[PDB]
Design a protein around this ligand. Structure first.
Ligand SMILES: *[C@@H]1O[C@H](CO)[C@@H](O[C@@H]2O[C@H](CO)[C@@H](O[C@@H]3O[C@H](CO)[C@@H](O)[C@H](O)[C@@H]3O)[C@H](O)[C@H]2NC(C)=O)[C@H](O)[C@H]1NC(C)=O
Ligand SMILES: *[C@@H]1O[C@H](CO)[C@@H](O[C@@H]2O[C@H](CO)[C@@H](O[C@@H]3O[C@H](CO)[C@@H](O)[C@H](O)[C@@H]3O)[C@H](O)[C@H]2NC(C)=O)[C@H](O)[C@H]1NC(C)=O
Ligand SMILES: *[C@@H]1O[C@H](CO)[C@@H](O[C@@H]2O[C@H](CO)[C@@H](O[C@@H]3O[C@H](CO)[C@@H](O)[C@H](O)[C@@H]3O)[C@H](O)[C@H]2NC(C)=O)[C@H](O)[C@H]1NC(C)=O
Ligand SMILES: *[C@@H]1O[C@H](CO)[C@@H](O[C@@H]2O[C@H](CO)[C@@H](O[C@@H]3O[C@H](CO)[C@@H](O)[C@H](O)[C@@H]3O)[C@H](O)[C@H]2NC(C)=O)[C@H](O)[C@H]1NC(C)=O
Ligand SMILES: *[C@@H]1O[C@H](CO)[C@@H](O[C@@H]2O[C@H](CO)[C@@H](O[C@@H]3O[C@H](CO)[C@@H](O)[C@H](O)[C@@H]3O)[C@H](O)[C@H]2NC(C)=O)[C@H](O)[C@H]1NC(C)=O
Ligand SMILES: *[C@@H]1O[C@H](CO)[C@@H](O[C@@H]2O[C@H](CO)[C@@H](O[C@@H]3O[C@H](CO)[C@@H](O)[C@H](O)[C@@H]3O)[C@H](O)[C@H]2NC(C)=O)[C@H](O)[C@H]1NC(C)=O
Ligand SMILES: *[C@@H]1O[C@H](CO)[C@@H](O[C@@H]2O[C@H](CO)[C@@H](O)[C@H](O)[C@H]2NC(C)=O)[C@H](O)[C@H]1NC(C)=O
Ligand SMILES: *[C@@H]1O[C@H](CO)[C@@H](O[C@@H]2O[C@H](CO)[C@@H](O)[C@H](O)[C@H]2NC(C)=O)[C@H](O)[C@H]1NC(C)=O
Ligand SMILES: *[C@@H]1O[C@H](CO)[C@@H](O[C@@H]2O[C@H](CO)[C@@H](O)[C@H](O)[C@H]2NC(C)=O)[C@H](O)[C@H]1NC(C)=O
Ligand SMILES: *[C@@H]1O[C@H](CO)[C@@H](O[C@@H]2O[C@H](CO)[C@@H](O)[C@H](O)[C@H]2NC(C)=O)[C@H](O)[C@H]1NC(C)=O
Ligand SMILES: *[C@@H]1O[C@H](CO)[C@@H](O[C@@H]2O[C@H](CO)[C@@H](O)[C@H](O)[C@H]2NC(C)=O)[C@H](O)[C@H]1NC(C)=O
Lengths: 271, 98, 132, 97, 49, 35
C-alpha cells in the first residue's frame, strides 16, 4: 500500500478529482461518490430458503486498494509493477510517455502549461458527462436487475399446482389419508425439482459470462495501468498515454488519458 | 492456543519519498524463474442410454421407445466433446512444423 | 507469444521484465517456466530536465541526466553507468529561456580535442617554419 | 488465394457447421412433436374427442410436461451455443482492431 | 486401392547445425498472403408457446 | 574482459579527412618554405 505525499505539487498538474478526500467520512473520491449514488418482495425470499451471503471485501477496502494503485502510478510511473518502487518527478514521466508515443520529448517541455490546462479541463468535463446522462451505467444495473428478476420468477413459479388437487401440500395432507396422498405429493416434488434444475443451469451460465468479463478486466488493468500498451484501441481511443482506475458497486471504471492530433497542413514530399 | 476472528490487513504500508528534482536508479539486477500451470484436456467419455437405465431387460426396451429420441440426442453432445478434446491438444502442441 | 518471441505485455509472461520461457508437459496440462529480469538494489541521485551552455538547451538522445552533487552525466534508465556529457549524447533545440527548471553546466565536444590538437600541431609547425 | 477458395471446399467448414447444426437442432424439436410421452396417442384432438373430461386431464398433463421439457432443452442448447459464438465474435473484433 | 491403418507421422526431422562462433543471415525474402475465417453471428429465432 | 574478442583495426571516418587536410596543409607549408 502506497501513500500520496502531503504536498501536492506536480508541476502544474492537478489530481484533486480522483484522489481520496480526507474530509468525507468515507475514504473515497468524488467520482466514486457519484458512481455510488448512481446505482441503487424481499421479505418472501428469506421465508422460502432464499438467502444472500454478504461479500468478503467491503467496498472501503476496495477504495483503499484503488487509492494505493493510483498513488503508485502517480509517484512511480510504471516501475512499481516490475519490481521495487522508484520515484521520479511527474514532468519527466510524461516526457518518457511522449517519447514512447514517437514524439521527441522537447515538445512537452516547451508546451507544459498548455498540456496541464488541457488535462485539468478534460478531467473536469467527465464529472458533468457522468452526471448528465442516467443511462451510462446500464451495464452495471443490468446484472442486478436480471438476477433479481430471475429469483423473483422462481419464487412466483412456486405458486403453480402441477396437476395436483391443490397448490399447497398441507391442504392435501390434512384433507386425505396418507396412502392416497402419496400420489399427489409426488407431482409437486417432481415439478419443483425441475424448476430448481432449470434455475441452477441459468445461474451457472451467467456466472461463466461474468467470469469472462472479470478476466478481461484483469487483463486491461494489468496492461493499461501498470504500464503502456502499443495495442491499437485497447487502452482507450487514439494514441494511449496513461490510465486511472476507479471503483463502483460490483464493477470497475477506467479513465484512459489519450493523445490525438488536431490540425493538419499538407506539403509536397520526396522519398 | 485458540481461534481468533479479526479484521483484514492489506499489507505493510510503505510510502515513497517524492521530490521535483530527484530520481532513483538501480545498479544491480536479479534473474528469476516463475512457474505457471494450465489445464488442457479432460478425459473423453461415452455413455449408452438403454443399457444404463434398463440394461439386460426387455420390458424397458418397449417402454423407452415411447418417450422419444433422447438416447440419440445425448450421444451427439458427448461425441462433440470427445472431438473437442483432441482439437484442443492439437492446437496447443502443434505450433512447430519441423 | 511467450516462447517463439519476446513479449512486452506486462505480467503476460511472468512478473517483471520478460526475457524468455520454456514449456513442459504434464498430465492434461502444461507448465511454463518464465525466465525474467528484475532490478536489484538502487541508489538515488539528483536530476535535471535539460542543460544550457551556449544560451541553447541540450536534451539526451536516450537516457537521463544525473548528478552526484559535483558534475552531471548521462545514464541509461535501468542501469547506472555515468558518462561524460559529449555532443553525440545530446541534441539541441531552442534556447534555454523556456524550459522550467533548467540547470547550468558545460558541454564537451568529443571532436574538439582532435581539432585543437591539430591546431596545436599547426602552431608548432608555424613556430618551426618561422626560422627558415 | 482465389484458386484456394475455388478448390478447397472444406476451408469454409467453420462457417458451414454454424448453419447446419442450427438447422439440425430445430428439426429435432419438430420431430419431438410426434412423440407419445406416455399417453394414449400423440394426436391431441384425437384423445380430446375420444374420451370424457374427468380423466383426460391426466393425458393433457402428460403432454404438457413432455413438450415443455423438450422445448426447455432446446432453449438451453441454444443458450450455450450463443455463448460460444459470443466469445468467437469478441476474439474476431479484437483481431480486426 | 484399399484402406490402411498406421501410426501417423510427427513431421519431417531437420537437425540444425549449432556452433559457438558461427551465425546465419538471410539474403533474399518473400511476401506471403494467408487467409483466416472467423464466425461472427448465428441465426436468430423465436418461439410461440 | 569480453570472451571471444578478435583483433582488427577500427576504421575511423574522420581519419582520412584529417589525413587529406594534413597533406594539403603540408603542401601549403612546402609552398611557404620558399618565402
Ligand atoms: C493549439 O491549440 C490550442 C488550443 O486551442 C491553442 O491555444 C488556444 O488558442 C485560442 C486562440 O488561438 C485561445 O483562445 C483565446 O483565449 C484567450 C484567453 O487565453 C481569450 O482572451 C480569447 O478571447 C480567446 O478565447 C485559447 O485560450 C488557447 N488555449 C490556451 C490553453 O491558452 C494554440 O494556440 C494552438 N497552437 C497553435 C500553434 O496554434
Ligand atoms: C550484485 O549482486 C550479486 C549477488 O549478491 C553480487 O555478487 C555477490 O558478491 C559477493 C561479494 O563478492 C559474494 O559473496 C561471497 O560469498 C562467498 C560464498 O559464496 C564467500 O566465500 C565470499 O567471501 C564472499 O562473501 C556473493 O557470493 C555474490 N553472489 C553470488 C550469487 O555469487 C554482486 O557483487 C553485486 N554487484 C553489484 C555491482 O552490486
Ligand atoms: C561525484 O563525482 C565526481 C566525479 O567523478 C567525483 O570527483 C572525483 O573524485 C575522484 C576521487 O576524489 C577524483 O579522482 C582523483 O583525482 C585526484 C586529483 O587530485 C587524483 O590525484 C587521483 O589519482 C584520482 O584520479 C576525480 O578527479 C574527481 N572528478 C573530477 C572531475 O575531478 C566526486 O568525488 C563525487 N562525489 C560523490 C559524493 O560521489
Ligand atoms: C546560468 O548561466 C547564465 C549565464 O548565461 C546566468 O545568467 C545570468 O543571470 C543573472 C541573474 O538572472 C544576470 O544578472 C542580471 O541579469 C538581468 C537579466 O536577466 C539583468 O537585467 C541585470 O542587470 C543583471 O545583469 C546575469 O547578467 C546573467 N548572465 C549573463 C551572462 O547573461 C544564469 O543566472 C545561470 N543560472 C541559471 C539560469 O539558473
Ligand atoms: C530474390 O528472389 C527473387 C525471386 O526468385 C529473384 O527474382 C527472380 O530473378 C530471376 C533471375 O533474375 C527471374 O528469372 C528471370 O525471369 C525472366 C522473365 O521475367 C527471364 O527472362 C529470365 O531468363 C529469368 O528466368 C525471376 O523472374 C525473378 N522473380 C520474379 C518474381 O520476377 C531475385 O533475383 C532474388 N535476388 C537475389 C539477390 O538473388
Ligand atoms: C591480439 O593482439 C594482442 C597484441 O597486440 C595479443 O596479446 C598478446 O598475446 C600474446 C600471446 O599470444 C602475448 O604477447 C607476449 O607478450 C609478452 C609480454 O607480456 C612478451 O614478452 C612476449 O614476447 C609476447 O610478445 C601477450 O599475452 C599479449 N601482448 C600484448 C602486448 O597484448 C592477443 O593475443 C591478440 N589476440 C588475438 C585474438 O589475435
Ligand atoms: C484542483 O482543482 C480543484 C477544482 O477547482 C481546485 O479546488 C478549488 O479550490 C479553491 C480553493 O483553493 C476553491 O475556491 C474552489 O471552489 C475549488 N474548486 C472547485 C470546488 O471546483 C483545487 O484548488 C485545484 N488544485 C490546484 C493545486 O490547482
Ligand atoms: C491540402 O489539404 C486541403 C484541405 O486540407 C486540400 O483542399 C482540398 O481542395 C479541394 C478543392 O477545393 C476540395 O475539393 C477538397 O475537399 C479539399 N480538401 C479537403 C480535405 O476538404 C488541398 O487540395 C490539399 N493540397 C495538397 C497539395 O495536399
Ligand atoms: C534517497 O532517498 C531518501 C528517502 O528514502 C532520502 O532521505 C533519507 O530518508 C530515510 C528515511 O526517510 C532516512 O533514513 C535517511 O537518513 C534520509 N537521508 C538523509 C541523507 O538524511 C535521501 O536523502 C535520498 N538521497 C539523497 C542523496 O538525497
Ligand atoms: C522544486 O520545489 C521546490 C520547493 O517548492 C522549489 O524551491 C523553491 O522554488 C521557489 C520558486 O521556484 C523559490 O521561490 C524558492 O526560493 C525555492 N526554495 C528555496 C529553498 O530556494 C524548486 O524551485 C522546485 N524546482 C523545480 C525544478 O520545480
Ligand atoms: C568455441 O569452441 C571452440 C571449439 O571447441 C573453442 O575455440 C578454441 O578452441 C581451442 C581448442 O580447440 C582453444 O585452444 C582456444 O583457446 C579456443 N578459442 C577461444 C577464443 O576460446 C572454444 O571451446 C570456444 N571458444 C570460445 C567460447 O571463445
Amino acid at each position: 500500500i502506497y501513500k500520496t505525499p502531503p504536498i501536492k505539487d506536480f508541476g502544474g498538474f492537478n489530481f484533486s478529482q480522483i484522489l481520496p478526500d480526507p474530509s468525507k467520512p468515507s475514504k473515497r473520491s468524488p467520482i466514486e461518490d457519484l458512481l455510488f449514488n448512481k446505482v441503487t418482495l424481499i421479505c418472501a425470499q428469506k421465508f422460502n430458503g432464499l438467502n444472500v451471503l454478504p461479500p468478503l471485501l467491503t467496498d472501503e477496502m476496495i477504495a483503499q486498494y484503488t487509492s494505493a494503485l493510483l498513488a503508485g502510478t502517480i509517484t512511480s510511473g510504471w516501475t512499481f509493477g516490475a519490481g521495487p518502487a522508484l520515484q521520479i518527478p511527474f514532468p519527466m514521466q510524461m516526457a518518457y510517455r511522449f517519447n514512447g508515443i514517437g514524439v521527441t520529448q522537447n515538445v512537452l517541455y516547451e508546451n507544459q502549461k498548455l498540456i496541464a490546462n488541457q488535462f485539468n479541463s478534460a478531467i473536469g468535463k467527465i464529472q458533468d458527462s457522468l452526471s448528465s446522462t442516467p443511462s451510462a451505467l446500464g451495464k452495471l444495473q443490468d446484472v442486478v436487475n436480471q438476477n433479481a428478476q430471475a429469483l423473483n420468477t422462481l419464487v412466483k413459479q412456486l405458486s403453480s399446482n402441477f396437476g395436483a388437487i391443490s397448490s399447497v401440500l398441507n391442504d392435501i395432507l390434512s384433507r386425505l389419508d396418507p396412502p392416497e396422498a402419496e400420489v399427489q405429493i409426488d407431482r409437486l416434488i417432481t415439478g419443483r425439482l425441475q424448476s430448481l434444475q432449470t434455475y441452477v443451469t441459468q445461474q451457472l451460465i451467467r456466472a461463466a459470462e461474468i467470469r469472462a468479463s472479470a478476466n478481461l478486466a484483469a487483463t486491461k488493468m494489468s496492461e493499461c495501468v501498470l504500464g503502456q500498451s502499443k495495442r491499437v484501441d485497447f487502452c482507450g481511443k487514439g494514441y494511449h498515454l496513461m490510465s486511472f482506475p476507479q471503483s463502483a458497486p460490483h464493477g470497475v471504471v477506467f479513465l484512459h488519458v489519450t493523445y490525438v492530433p488536431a490540425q493538419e497542413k499538407n506539403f509536397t514530399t520526396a522519398p | 492456543q485458540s481461534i481468533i476472528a479479526y479484521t483484514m490487513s492489506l499489507g505493510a504500508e510503505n510510502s515513497v519519498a517524492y521530490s521535483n528534482n530527484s530520481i532513483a536508479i538501480p545498479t544491480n539486477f536479479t534473474i528469476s524463474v516463475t512457474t505457471e500451470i494450465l489445464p488442457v484436456s479432460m478425459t473423453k467419455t461415452s455413455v449408452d442410454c438403454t443399457m444404463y437405465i434398463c440394461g439386460d431387460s426387455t420390458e424397458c426396451s418397449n417402454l423407452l421407445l415411447q418417450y422419444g429420441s433422447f438416447c440419440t440426442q445425448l450421444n451427439r453432445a458427448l461425441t462433440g466433446i470427445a472431438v473437442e478434446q483432441d482439437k484442443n491438444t492439437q492446437e496447443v502442441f502443434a505450433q512447430v512444423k519441423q | 507469444e511467450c516462447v517463439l518471441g519476446q513479449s512486452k505485455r506486462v505480467d503476460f509472461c511472468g512478473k517483471g521484465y520478460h526475457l524468455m520461457s520454456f514449456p513442459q508437459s504434464a498430465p492434461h496440462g502444461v507448465v511454463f517456466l518464465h525466465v525474467t529480469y528484475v532490478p536489484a538494489q538502487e541508489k538515488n541521485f539528483t536530476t535535471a530536465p535539460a542543460i544550457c551552455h551556449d544560451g541553447k538547451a541540450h536534451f539526451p538522445r536516450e537516457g537521463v541526466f544525473v548528478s552526484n552533487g559535483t558534475h552531471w552525466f548521462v545514464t541509461q534508465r535501468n542501469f547506472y553507468e555515468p558518462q561524460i556529457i559529449t555532443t553525440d549524447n545530446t541534441f539541441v533545440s531552442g534556447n534555454c529561456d523556456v524550459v522550467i527548471g533548467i540547470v547550468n553546466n558545460t558541454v564537451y565536444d568529443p571532436l574538439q580535442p582532435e581539432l585543437d590538437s591539430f591546431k596545436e600541431e599547426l602552431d608548432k609547425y608555424f613556430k618551426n617554419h618561422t626560422s627558415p
